[PDB]
Design a protein around this ligand. Structure first.
Ligand SMILES: NC(=O)c1ccc[n+]([C@@H]2O[C@H](COP(=O)([O-])OP(=O)(O)OC[C@H]3O[C@@H](n4cnc5c(N)ncnc54)[C@H](O)[C@@H]3O)[C@@H](O)[C@H]2O)c1
Ligand SMILES: NC(=O)c1ccc[n+]([C@@H]2O[C@H](COP(=O)([O-])OP(=O)(O)OC[C@H]3O[C@@H](n4cnc5c(N)ncnc54)[C@H](O)[C@@H]3O)[C@@H](O)[C@H]2O)c1
Ligand SMILES: NC(=O)c1ccc[n+]([C@@H]2O[C@H](COP(=O)([O-])OP(=O)(O)OC[C@H]3O[C@@H](n4cnc5c(N)ncnc54)[C@H](O)[C@@H]3O)[C@@H](O)[C@H]2O)c1
Ligand SMILES: NC(=O)c1ccc[n+]([C@@H]2O[C@H](COP(=O)([O-])OP(=O)(O)OC[C@H]3O[C@@H](n4cnc5c(N)ncnc54)[C@H](O)[C@@H]3O)[C@@H](O)[C@H]2O)c1
Lengths: 331, 331, 331, 331
């Protein structure tokens, strides 16, 4: 004689298992900006939230659930134990220490490497066949770290990489040309940091190479100082951090972007961190951003950008900076 | 080396298996309406189209394929064959004859049962676990036929029903009260045809019962003629058929709504066709629309709506009307 | 010639005037939640952000601007100034103090009225025709203050109200019955706070009245404790504040829903804060939530819900509770 | 004592005027594929349908309205008199005679020029400040025709042009490279017909010019026959027409694309028909496809593609073919 029973006549029961589950590790600025972005884009039927902060974790779960009416993701769960993570198609990693004002992402390696040695084994135990998306900084170094501990194939370990760096670039080009960013094509390759390489030789609007029209564009001295557009891409993190304390909206938006190409299997090209041994005459185990076709299996192919010698030389420079760190860890 | 081999460095092969595959059976006015509507709502990662008319088929496929840039469903395929439908989560059957001007949907029964006798075993064999969504008319009777041939549990054999008739009802109510269809609540149960029941005991705007404010509302011969709204619902198909020859945009929207609740496992309540033996004093195996909770497994529950004696009377005469045609068992 | 002049041939200048401009006043947790949610629903063609904290402001703007590639709102601007808010169709005011742990929203009244005294005339002067959406707490009392200072007709001064509390109610009901919030109907009217009224006379699933099946439902001391659901609604804010310190994702969703009905002129019914003098025996100028029909002009109509004697009693004590604080007229 | 009056307490009245109205002239295959696409993308708050076929017109209006529940465009209107069109932001023209099997779009000029002399004056009378989007064939010639009769500025008269041709191209490239079309950049310029020019010199994936890697790509004799990809772009219309009778889905999708860049003012680059006198050393009044930045004022800028002499020569050839027709009309 329960209200339920007078109302509803049961046929079936509580199957459980999700088809499109996504986990978000870390429910801080970035982790909830990832979460909100991915929920608004309707990519998951089940989202799992994990953090060591219990109170914060349950509190943000409840604020997302209160919003159920307006969403199309009917199961929102969270916990400290990784069992909640079970059978995730994708695991977004956002946990760890963040940059203080004027702090290099490279300073974070000791503290975040200790976080990863802890969580990687726990997430691979419950989801042996997930696509790992690393966001935590220094993201190129942590993506290697996840690869190294997880034991996964190089395709299922992705670092968010220069997806963000190239969106700010497009945005800055777009404002000089008076064209929407979607329409200015420009690649920011290498490290998601101070050593990123702009590929000047490939920047274009509607198939036209801005460097054939303006040979002075890029890695020099004279101009309309296009070079400073790469430099604001490099200082953009520092400046936003100095102004609000941290960055969150643009990375959350750039993670939903990748997460749509993985979940829908579109095979779109994105500058993301992947293993590059055997490609630019880089003979080591470096992870840095290259254009990669991203799908349901992760990184299925890498695009061999034609790079000039100025360009190819700042990419080797970015890749050495980076293995100078990586070699000292080996956990 | 191909231009392909120069441009792209391959890291994997693998088994391209669909996660959210939708099959549309019959590429006519209703099929393509369903198809476009499902593609614009980005519910599938692969859509498969089957039809007997080989040319029509290829043509609709190519037209949809050339709009690929504007969609997020990477794989669009067809065949006469059914090998192309494998591992579908849902299959929408729109194949068959439709009404000529002034023709009852019950009159198509004989021709459509003949095609269901061949299509169901070809479907049931290649997607053992799909949800069958029956749109072909008379929808109630083909849903029962589909069930019967398939061997599937009832949870997984859904007729499109009064989802559409309720939408039309809400629209019309909407007009009169000066509020969007979304804020006008009300259900059309029973046959998706001339015998459908308006449930005036339940029509409301914000929780207030219109039958409580105006006791003469509807199945009353008295003053503002709310009853003429139900006659417009009944008549609406006949009327669009006399003006454009067929109906398509409303039912393609109506099917993608449904499709949405199933793929995302929403657990929303839809007036759809299901087996109502046991409920509302119905002793025969007939299919008709009753409010059902829809999810990744099909109908998991039926809501027991509390009908007035006159509304129950009218539902029973609706099941009595379908059973009369249903003793023909030509399969 | 610039690279710009070589690449692009200009055909026009013109007056870039916004058609769907939205202003968010206050770039705190609630403001940015509202902002991202409105940007992902692509409701505006230009969004303007105003705050007194100059750095925070620039920072949030730049973060949102760097995600431009992933949005469809081409112009994102800010200023401390209010010249930036010109010709807005809607303005969302989220500026002010929020609750500390265990603090009543009524306690912020004094501090928020002091800021409304400066912000309203700066808003009212540059968008003579905008719709004002008040989110700042106590929302009911600031909506009345906003009205009073502005000189605007009541149609165009909206408090966010119980839209949120109804969402939370539907969520909780949802859980218990095993259906999505969207198919559970029910309203929280009165104060957006401790005095809110559950309208149990109207809670339904598919037109059936839960109070009809279970007469003991709610404002009854009897058996399954549906009344504890209302206490969780009342308590939910306090509880997320004790766990994460503030609430933000639910109200940003809740505001974009509202925003949607206004920009598209949907004529949907939302429980929002409006002037209820005349209705339900209310003799004083108080603002509280009642079901309202929302459109391009603001509130065009109020639905007269038929309250049980105990529900009316409770609404009146809710207006009696707001009026007690409302005789303070410090403006 | 009407139901309405007991239910709703009126505050305001029936303002009317829309903010985002779109008209669709012609409710045939293309016109309703435009309509459905534009409604699903939620671009208008008001859609106006116009046709001389009265029955068909009212019938498709009703099928769209029946679908109101599932849409976010609350006013759907239609008529034979142009008064319904009043104060449209955008007017999509799809009316006219279509290609029979093996028929050139150039054969349609006599019959469609008579349609335009009739409707242009009627649409400019009611919407003096609309953006005209011509879809009817031969679209380059009709866009000139609308320009010439309307008296409008060259920015507010757009022909759908090679937006479709470039999407099929991207699609065909995408299938050879195994990359999503969104990621293969390739421009189809000139006439939306048999004389279209592929700009081989600008085709790329992630900033890399396929012609520097494969100099043989394009307008020759030897290869992997990339040249046949342009040729299937040219025969694609004929083949779909031969298979289903006409084309509709891809153009409807490509019209919603342009219509979003106009309505949201994104300033995106699109290959569309515009006046090109004074640009490729073309000294006459030709309308053909060029990359143009499209916004709320229409075509605000044209992008000066760097073209090779093979390329620049097929573009002059396309532009002469076209003015050989145009010069014989002069109405
Ligand atoms: N890759 C990119 O572009 C990008 C961009 C911006 C931010 N960042 C990075 O994102 C990371 C997070 O920044 P943020 O603002 O959200 O930080 P935050 O302080 O707001 O949140 C970090 C979260 O990590 C959690 N955490 C710590 N140990 C954990 C463990 N074992 N398991 C789960 N969670 C744990 C915390 O409790 C905290 O809630 C930083 O490393 C940062 O530099 C990356
Ligand atoms: N349930 C609803 O509300 C409702 C709404 C509208 C229409 N319908 C029904 O939709 C069905 C289809 O309507 P329609 O306008 O698209 O008809 P249509 O003639 O446009 O298309 C029907 C198609 O079915 C295909 N078909 C026939 N037999 C087949 C077989 N064995 N295998 C594969 N394909 C086969 C045809 O070849 C044709 O392409 C009709 O039965 C109609 O009455 C139902
Ligand atoms: N109505 C609802 O349901 C509800 C929901 C949640 C929160 N709120 C209310 O939202 C309001 C904002 O909450 P919050 O978390 O974002 O606070 P917050 O402190 O995060 O941000 C408040 C912001 O207001 C700005 N501000 C203060 N005075 C201003 C002025 N004169 N001009 C411009 N900006 C000014 C601040 O500088 C700060 O950026 C609080 O009053 C809170 O109680 C309402
Ligand atoms: N530009 C492109 O890529 C493109 C692509 C494909 C189709 N086409 C064109 O679109 C046009 C329409 O093709 P379709 O399949 O929809 O044709 P259709 O036969 O289905 O419909 C044409 C509509 O034009 C209407 N019409 C005729 N005179 C009219 C008048 N004064 N006012 C309003 N409507 C009038 C008709 O009544 C008919 O409903 C053709 O010219 C065709 O070649 C353009």
């Amino acid at each position: 004689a329960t209200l339920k029973d007078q109302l509803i006549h049961n046929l079936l029961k509580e199957e459980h298992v999700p088809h499109n589950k996504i986990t978000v590790v870390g429910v801080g600025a970035v982790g909830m900006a990832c979460a909100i972005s991915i929920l608004m884009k309707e990519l998951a039927d089940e989202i799992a939230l994990v953090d060591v902060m219990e109170d914060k974790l349950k509190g943000e779960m409840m604020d997302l659930q209160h919003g159920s009416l307006f969403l199309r993701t009917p199961k929102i769960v969270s916990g400290k134990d990784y069992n909640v993570t079970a059978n995730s198609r994708l695991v977004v990693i956002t946990a760890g220490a963040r940059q203080q004002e004027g702090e290099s992402r490279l300073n974070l390696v000791q503290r975040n490497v200790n976080i990863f040695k802890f969580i990687i084994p726990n997430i691979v135990k419950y989801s042996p066949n997930c696509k790992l998306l690393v966001v935590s900084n220094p993201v190129d170094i942590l993506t290697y770290v996840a690869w190294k501990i997880s034991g996964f194939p190089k395709n299922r370990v992705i670092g968010s990489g220069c997806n963000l760096d190239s969106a700010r670039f497009r945005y800055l080009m777009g404002e000089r040309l008076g064209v929407h960013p979607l329409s200015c094509h420009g690649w920011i390759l290498g490290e998601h940091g101070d050593s990123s390489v702009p590929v000047w030789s490939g920047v274009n609007v509607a198939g036209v190479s801005l460097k054939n029209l303006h040979p002075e564009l890029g890695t020099d001295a004279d101009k309309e100082h296009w070079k400073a557009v790469h430099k604001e891409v490099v200082d953009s993190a520092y400046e936003v951090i100095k102004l609000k304390g941290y960055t969150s909206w643009a990375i959350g938006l750039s993670v939903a972007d990748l997460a749509e190409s993985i979940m829908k299997n579109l095979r779109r090209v994105h500058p993301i961190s992947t293993m590059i041994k055997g490609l630019y005459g880089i003979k080591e185990n470096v992870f840095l951003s290259v254009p990669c076709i991203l799908g349901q299996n992760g990184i299925s192919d890498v695009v061999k950008v034609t790079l000039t010698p100025e360009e190819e030389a700042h990419l080797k420079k970015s890749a050495d900076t980076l293995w100078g760190i990586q070699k000292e860890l080996q956990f």
